Task: inverse folding
């Protein structure tokens, strides 16, 4: 064991050499729904390798004035691969997520990201009574941006976001963060299109900087999410 | 607890459960951190 | 997972100059909180701490009776030229967000499973009219009727929806002790959710609001004065108190900082200046090197 | 019948009473219990979780600027870099923390605190800091010679990016009070101060102005008593549906 | 006959292509309901259902307290030139049909055997006169007297039939908790009948009405204000609530669709248009192929 | 005497309370118990009995016309014949059923439903239908290619005159709500649709326009909770003796 | 066992070849009143063969617009055979009924009847407060017609009539229905002339039809009722 | 003290209730029982005459 | 059940009887229907 990690799910394999650890959210690993907790009586489809694999989303440019980014699960993966098709074709879904955030910079660069898995992250809007529109909330694989990262866009605090399963990417120590998410719902399964269990948020707490010849460096942030123990019930036409 | 009624949910405040597992939130890491050890 | 009835004891510690052992250094990047003990950061004495923890149990922290509803209607003859509607009642649409102390305290967790003890506290005042001689508050009979989701609501004091043949209702007078009952854990799911990152309708229309949970549709409380109208106008104020019992709590949240604005969403305006402003939660001090309450001698 | 005398406290509603009550839904079957991860049994579990402090709570920092402390290379020696008030009850860096917010729901508190500082400069940037906890009695130290005489830790930057200082439980009384009078013997915890031990040294290729993020949590010897309505949240009217 | 505390569990099922086995086909002509299991109609998983059934017990379904009587008389001096009759009381003629919620719920069975808990809820209002100054509701003593079949009924408040030496009577005041007692199963037969396909008289005359049962002649409830008349007019409203206990139920009926019109028979007029019209019980939709609440995206 | 404190809930009348009360007729001997056939112990026994659905709830059918679906020989293929809304709370074919009327006395429900269709044409008339239960999420299917992708049964007419389709319990929550909002996630069950698999074929001697009668019942995995006053029955005044 | 049935009570024997089954109302068979349930102390007369036998009533023409027919028991048999005489001569009666409805049509004909045994069927009249007259209620062996079969002439529903012991005659499957009725009363015996325990109802749910040369076909409906375990108490003059 | 809730039927006088009550003449010695012929235990004995 | 009064009919709601026999109403047929079998 060390600062090195290889994650292997189906076709996919990710390696990192500047890791910290694996954050198992609430010290739990995702598992398939047992019979004692089962509600939907139809036999579920458990596609292991075709769905439980790393889906890499589009990267984001870390800027000096970057407020931060969020991706809502499963919305981020609902129009991607066989996870998307099984979502489009089924009423109910259940899955955990292995999230892996990647950011490479030099030993001369400075900057820190908080990577937070927030359960049931209800976005609050500043300076209005009107609740957030479908467009603002459901952005899919492109994800959304933080307007008020200080308040977690919730009227809460970034300060107290460390209750939530989290890691840091401190360019001194770390180029990659890894958070294992189990199923988080009051119900055993849910409708993927109209509810998100998790929100993976990447907030720059300390800004990206360099010295004299390392300013304005192009530093992307890449997010790879692997569904874990994915189940689907209610086989119908595709929506 | 006492409960003078038929239903169990009608009972008073439940008997104190002093079980604590702060590791869920304080050390939720795959490989456990050893006290005094460099945790890299 | 261990039993903690009393806080941790302190063990006597000695001088330690050992290579390869750095208990005061941690890696915050792992997501793990510092594991450094006082015993290994400083030289400590033996302390046998007998401080109890029962008051910090979630049963004790949430299991106090809190106000969840305050409604006031005028108790009088509401009849006119052509109304025939007495209107000596109110309907609430059950929720736990109207009052911020219980809301912020409940909103410290994502999921809660609890049975709830309810206590209704009624109060009367004579309405200050042009010619009004006070001499005492009538011992009126009140009816609080829980109208579940999809049941017919009352439109008047004299309505027959008040039958309550199957609707749970409680009859209680003014000069009696405040009405009390326990509602069970009554969610369609295994826990109540204080936040819903999603929609409660299958349609994608504006009318389908973000944050509304399809398990918080809990029906309505309809409360009436059973007594027919008095010759004078009274104002009945009803206070409903909620005490969670047999509580299970999951996924602790970041506490609310900005003041609440409504019960339909968690939106905010913030206060004009610190504290609890959108750009400044903690009040300002002059500098990072300034102690505002510095003890001067 | 059963011989009966109604005592004082009869016909009273106490908001902290513990009695069984009439079930409104007789023989109601509640939804079967289902396992959800992250179950909290005690508020003492949450105060043990690290949370960032607004050390930079100044009228020039906005939003995320307030949660980081700008550490720079000094053209001087032994100089004070930043202070931390330990008045949880008063508007200070510890207020908007998991410790602060949840302890602020109580009146009495006892136990040792941990404060962890993460250095967020360059891998090539080096430095030695001295963070000191001064127990109460007199003024906050402004010279390193005075601060070093109290409980302190010397911080060498390196592969381990963070340092903890244990603010140990040092009080005459078994408990302290979250009192509006900061200068009260019942309330005052003392001072935390950070000085340069050597300096911050960064090569030309690396930025000279780095940042430190401060976190605070409670240890396992931590206790709270006498629950109260938090002053964090206020209300002028019943919250409407819209406005 | 088996014990069912929780609903049936679901067993895991496999693919089945077997000749001579057609579990999805039934013969409705036998009068038997389909016996097709989900396990044998689709591919199912193992589900251990812990949903309780205690709330669907006929004891729970019927054993709630329902309103069965609402009567209001004026409490005043009714005396005139030559009356000498005080008239500060009412007589009900016991029944369970005046209020539709308990009637329709009881009428879901042919026969019921239950002991009944009764609760009487009185309420006063000052009568709005030309010159009326309110200052509080007198704590009046009320007397509810059960007058069985063939006993002398009271003709006045001041009558001596109120002796109640052998007639069951309860004395209860306004500011006290509502009066309560249990009446036993008191039918001449082994069960109460909600419907009587026959006549209660031996004669064949029009006066002998169809549907009247010769076991529903249950006598009368006579309720009086025991206090002599006040100097001002009060209106006493009495509400009687019925809670069936120790219930046995037989021969479940088709539920009532049309609104009730009287307590002597089960006749109907129906509503002008659907729903619950004589020719249309369920509301109209455009076509058999039209979804009225179709989810559009 | 016995030391006594009257608590909150003293002097209250709760319509769902479970207490013994004073017997009005002391030492009264009730009529001896006699065996009557068809004794009901649970409302779950009645919802398990089949009851006809108003599938033809249209503003051209009157009385018994509303309980039968006119099935005819088609000059087309794969066409939709009829739909069934599954909104028990809303005015639909399932409302005036034993399932509907008795479930409508409750707020929450869970379990699988059975819907049996009896063909009532001629012995000489043949046909194949496909009845499909679409779980919720999107629009009701209008093409057989879309409907076949959901839970369905293909129905061959013959000596066994009826077919059952099990509407299986497929929901995220342990219970659904009888809510006035049909399009709510808490309430929506989805859709039942019937298409022609082949066609209806009748010889000249037999009528071309046949009928189907639909019945619906609950299975043994069916549950109801949170009793309420049914909206089926209303009242504007105390029901008089005559009028 | 099969789709064929022979019913034999006393002199009588009915055979059918297009049967479905025998419906035993509430899964019970009629039996004689036991001593533990006995009230009337006089020794009862139990005439087996002379009363417990199939009485065939007058047939009814099934029309395209037929609303349906009902027969109230024992009123239907109170002026027929030795069952009638024992009724006329006694105060009290107790009996079950084996009801057998018959309807023959071709394999080319279509139509469906619901045959319902309704206990204590109190007839509700549409558009009046006046309760049904003796004439309207007591029609004897001739029986009565449904004005509102949709409402079971009760302000109830035909839809929910399947609670009651019932069979169907679907001309595809079935030409005969058979329902065994046990004693249904809150009392052990009753007065036959002024109360009916049962109402046998025949409602056309799907109308009688044929194709081009099978229209306007004469299709009667025949009802045969056999009293089962008949008892009589209170021997007096005939009424 | 003993935890107490006054139910419906509290403070009511029912003429058919069966409860013990306060003795007005404490330690009162009633006249010794003496045999009298024709003792009636049931009203059903009189209707048989 | 508890009952503070002399008569048994004065007692509270009777102890839950969970006995169910829906066959009385769902399969009231002389010859029982076998599951999966053609019931003709
Ligand atoms: C979110 C969330 C919502 C809840 C449950 C709140 C309980 O809601 C009530 C309240 C406050 C009062 C009554 C009530 N008050 O009186 C009556 C009665 F009279 F009908 F019995 N019912 C019923 C319910 C379900 O818990 N978490
Ligand atoms: C049909 C049918 C009828 C019944 C019994 C109804 C109970 O009737 C009552 C009612 C509602 C009240 C009283 C009553 N209320 O008060 C008194 C008392 F004061 F006399 F005790 N008696 C007595 C009876 C028999 O059950 N099924």
Result:
């Amino acid at each position: 064991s060390d600062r090195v990690l290889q994650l292997k799910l189906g076709n996919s394999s990710i390696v990192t050499q500047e890791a910290a650890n694996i954050c198992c959210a609430y010290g739990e690993w995702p598992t398939y729904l047992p019979d004692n907790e089962a509600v939907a009586i139809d036999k579920p489809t458990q596609p292991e390798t075709s769905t439980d694999r790393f889906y890499t989303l589009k990267s984001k440019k870390w800027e000096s004035n970057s407020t931060g980014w969020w991706w809502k699960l499963p919305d981020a993966l609902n129009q991607i691969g066989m996870f998307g098709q099984n979502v489009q074709y089924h009423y109910l879904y259940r899955s955990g997520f292995l999230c892996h955030v990647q950011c490479n910079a030099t030993k001369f660069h400075q900057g820190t990201l908080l990577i937070v898995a927030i359960p049931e992250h209800q976005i609050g809007k500043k300076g209005t009574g009107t609740s957030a529109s479908f467009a603002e909330v459901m952005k899919g694989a492109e994800g959304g941006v933080f307007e008020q990262p200080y308040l977690l866009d919730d009227g809460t605090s970034l300060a107290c976001a460390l209750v939530y399963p989290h890691q840091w990417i401190n360019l001194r120590t770390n180029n990659s963060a890894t958070i294992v998410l189990p199923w988080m719902n009051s119900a055993p399964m849910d409708f993927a299109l109209r509810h998100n269990n998790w929100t993976l948020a990447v907030i720059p707490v300390c800004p990206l900087a360099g010295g004299t010849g390392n300013t304005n460096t192009y530093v992307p942030i890449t997010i790879s999410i692997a569904p874990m123990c994915a189940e689907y019930n209610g086989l119908r036409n595709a929506i | 607890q006492i409960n003078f009624y038929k239903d169990s949910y009608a009972a008073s405040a439940s008997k104190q459960d002093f079980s604590q597992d702060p590791s869920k939130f304080t050390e939720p890491v795959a490989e456990a951190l050893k006290a005094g050890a460099p945790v890299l | 997972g261990e039993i903690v009835k009393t806080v941790a004891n302190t063990v006597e510690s000695e001088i330690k100059a050992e290579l390869g052992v750095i208990p005061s250094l941690n890696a915050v990047e792992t997501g793990a909180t510092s594991n450094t003990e006082p015993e290994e950061a400083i030289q400590t004495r033996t302390v046998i701490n007998m401080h109890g923890t029962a008051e910090c149990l979630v049963e004790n922290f949430l299991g106090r009776s809190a106000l969840v509803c305050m409604r006031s209607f005028e108790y009088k003859n509401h009849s006119t030229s052509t109304s025939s509607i007495q209107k000596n009642f109110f309907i609430w649409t059950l929720n736990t967000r109207e009052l911020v102390q219980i809301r912020r305290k409940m909103e410290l967790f994502t999921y809660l499973r609890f049975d709830t003890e309810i206590t209704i506290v009624p109060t009367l005042r004579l309405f200050s009219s042009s010619n009004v001689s006070f001499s005492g508050l009538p011992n009126l009979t009140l009816q609080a009727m829980y109208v579940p989701t999809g049941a017919r609501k009352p439109s008047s004091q004299d309505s027959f929806e008040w039958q309550s043949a199957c609707n749970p209702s409680v009859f209680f007078k003014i000069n009696d002790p405040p009405a009390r009952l326990t509602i069970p854990f009554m969610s369609i799911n295994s826990a109540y959710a204080n936040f819903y990152d999603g929609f409660a309708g299958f349609e994608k229309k504006a009318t389908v609001l973000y944050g509304i949970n399809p398990a918080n549709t809990m029906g309505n409380l309809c409360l009436r004065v059973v007594n027919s109208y008095q010759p004078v106008q009274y104002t009945l104020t009803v206070r409903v108190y909620m005490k969670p019992k047999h509580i299970k709590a999951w996924a602790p949240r970041a506490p609310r900082t900005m003041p609440y604005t409504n019960i339909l969403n968690n939106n905010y305006a913030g206060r004009s200046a610190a504290p609890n402003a959108p750009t400044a939660i903690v009040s300002h001090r002059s500098t990072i090197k300034t102690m505002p309450n510095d003890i001067n001698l | 019948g059963v011989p009966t005398c109604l005592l004082p406290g009869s016909n009273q509603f106490l908001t902290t009473d513990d009695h069984s009550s009439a079930p409104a839904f007789p023989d109601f079957s509640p939804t079967p219990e289902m396992h959800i991860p992250g179950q909290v049994h005690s508020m003492l579990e949450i105060v043990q979780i690290e949370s960032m402090m607004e050390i930079n709570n100044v009228n020039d920092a906005s939003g995320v600027e307030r949660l980081r402390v700008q550490i720079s290379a000094q053209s001087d020696m032994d100089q004070l870099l930043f202070n931390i008030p330990l008045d949880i009850q008063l508007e200070g860096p510890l207020r908007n923390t998991l410790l602060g917010n949840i302890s602020r729901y109580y009146t009495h508190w006892s136990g040792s605190l941990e404060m962890t500082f993460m250095f967020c400069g360059s891998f090539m940037t080096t430095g030695k800091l001295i963070i000191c906890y001064t127990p109460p009695g007199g003024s906050s130290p402004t010279d390193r010679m005075q601060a070093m005489l109290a409980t302190h830790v010397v911080w060498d930057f390196g592969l381990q990016s963070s340092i903890t200082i244990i603010i140990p439980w040092i009080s005459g009384s078994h408990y302290r009070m979250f009192n509006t009078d900061a200068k009260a013997i019942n309330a005052n915890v003392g001072y935390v101060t950070c000085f340069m031990q050597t300096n911050l040294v960064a090569p030309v290729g690396a930025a000279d102005q780095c940042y430190i993020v401060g976190m605070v949590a409670a240890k396992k010897d931590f206790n709270l008593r006498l629950m109260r309505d938090s002053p964090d949240i206020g209300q002028s009217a019943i919250l409407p549906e819209q406005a």
Q: What stands out?
A: Residues 98-103 of chain F form the longest helix (6 residues). Chain F touches chain A at residues 110, 112, 134-138, 141, 146-147, 149-151, 168-174, 185, 190, 221 (CB under 8 Å). Residues 1-243 of chain F form one domain. Chain F is about 5% helix and 35% strand.
